[model samples]
Target: GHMQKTAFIWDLDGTLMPGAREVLAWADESGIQQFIYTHKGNNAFTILKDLGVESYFTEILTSQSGFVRKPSPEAATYLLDKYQLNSDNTYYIGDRTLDVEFAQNSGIQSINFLESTYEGNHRIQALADISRIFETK
Candidate 1:
């Protein structure tokens, strides 16, 4: 299930929540390919750098890349086309409505990393729980 069987495309806004590093390390150890798609500027790296999570990503496409922004499929489509990612194996994890829409726009599954009653489908309270969805039994 969910495998080609490993790959993640991430959304980098509001930064990763608690336990983010732990799961990221686990994903890295497990050989999961990770990527970032954010509307942030190139200084976005500083956010990843401060979290010490920059190396976990396979590629980062942001506003700096000059692709059309959110709810638009341009950037995500590029990644899918370039890497030839298995559509079923790939997931987009983000914390907002637009993030969910972004995934839909690109024809992929979405995991809404939310808190309190923020919103969106496939919502996960803790980021670490997401790994369970992609785990092999």
Candidate 2:
């Protein structure tokens, strides 16, 4: 079987694809589910599609959608369930302190990209190269 099973919830701005534009394309190529949670304006999705990343993420969770920022537990919980993901087995690769704290509090392993957020970082971006954190299946 050539089936690939993997999921990743990522930060946008300083993580993922530098500007949330091409992250999806990269994620699509890697068979990864990527999400961008940002407090930025409404151009997030447009940017991603423009950068040719429309198919990477399973869905885009945005604060501009009247959604609150993460660390609320609800946001993380919603994304996890929405993506049919297991928090304990999932990895949150983000770039901010909030990204770290939220994943930690939610029982999800967090990977903070200390460097840039471009796709280049995706290679040496700590946990991006891994599949899952703790597997139950």
Candidate 3:
């Protein structure tokens, strides 16, 4: 309801591309609630661990989490309510066009992470750029 706590949601696969761990490290230091909402299943666990940022996430929402596919917004919608997130401040990052659409559908801000064809509220070429996006106000 308020903008005090920010939830940083992310898409797996292409978005976590490479160097994502750097962003996760920064997010960890920033104290925001980090989440991963991916259609990918348990593979997300392996990827995050391989990226060495498995600890950065507060929760990882997969299809098994009981939600429809993205672009439906149901997944993110459920997460918004389940996590008690502030829609204004919450940020969803992804690398596909559907990801951008998902963010819009969910009413949260979005960052296009170098692979999306659509422009979003924010755009970053590298994971480190997220530092600027979340820089202290």
Per-candidate clash tally: 0, 3, 0
- Give the TM-scores of the predictions, in the order they appear: 0.78, 0.64, 0.77
lDDT preference between candidates 1 and 3, better one: 3
Better of 1 and 2 by lDDT: 1
- Sorted by lDDT, highest first, which candidate order results? 3, 1, 2
Candidate 2, residues 1-137, lDDT tens digits: the string is 12255566755655534544344445467665566566766677787678676556666767666755556667767777785777665556765565656665676655555643322222235442443322222
Q: Give the alpha carbon lDDT tens digit for every residue of 6-104 in model 1.
A: 567776656456767777777777776788877678877887788777888988877888887666777767777776776556677777776666666
Write one digit per residue (lDDT tens) for candidate 3, span 1-137.
12257778876666644576667766777677888876778777887788677888888977678776656777666667886777767888766667677667777777775555444467777767777765644
Task: Indicate whether candidate 1 or candidate 3 has the larger TM-score.
Answer: 1
Candidate 1 Cα misplacement greater than 4 A, ranges: 1-3, 15-17, 113-121
**Which candidate number has the best TM-score?**
1
Each prediction's RMSD over C-alphas, in Å, is 3.9, 6.6, 3.9
Superposition error at 56 for model 1 (Å):
0.7
lDDT of 1 at 2: 27
